[PDB]
């Protein structure tokens, strides 16, 4: 569901 | 390590 590869949003993990 | 919560690159949950 979305729209490229892993779970959750952005690139990487955690926040900043 | 990143920009943002969960892994890896893009929005929602899986691959395509
Ligand atoms: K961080
Ligand atoms: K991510």
């Known amino acids: ?3 490229x590869a892993x779970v959750x949003w952005x690139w990487x993990w955690x926040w900043x």
């Open 1 to 3: 569901v979305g729209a």
